[PDB]
Amino acid sequence: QALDSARSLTGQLMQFGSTLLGLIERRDAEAMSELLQNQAGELMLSSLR
């Protein structure tokens, strides 16, 4: 029964780990997508220039 209680918490820890990896990679996706846009802006500046 101690084993089952720990196995339940380890399953929940795995769920946290999956969600955390998802959020990490998703935040890094948003940061890149914003970097690309900032670059496109400071590049259209030279294009207009």
Place this chain on the structure above:
Amino acid sequence: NLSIDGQPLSLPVFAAPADPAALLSAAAAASGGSKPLPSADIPAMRFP
């Protein structure tokens, strides 16, 4: 200060054009408070 044909002997007024402005928009952090916990009560069931 023209010539015999009326063409100007001076150099024309040149004017450096303006550099097109860099666009800039407002970017603000989202703000919001947490939510307070609800009132507590002893349930019908034991803790486990």
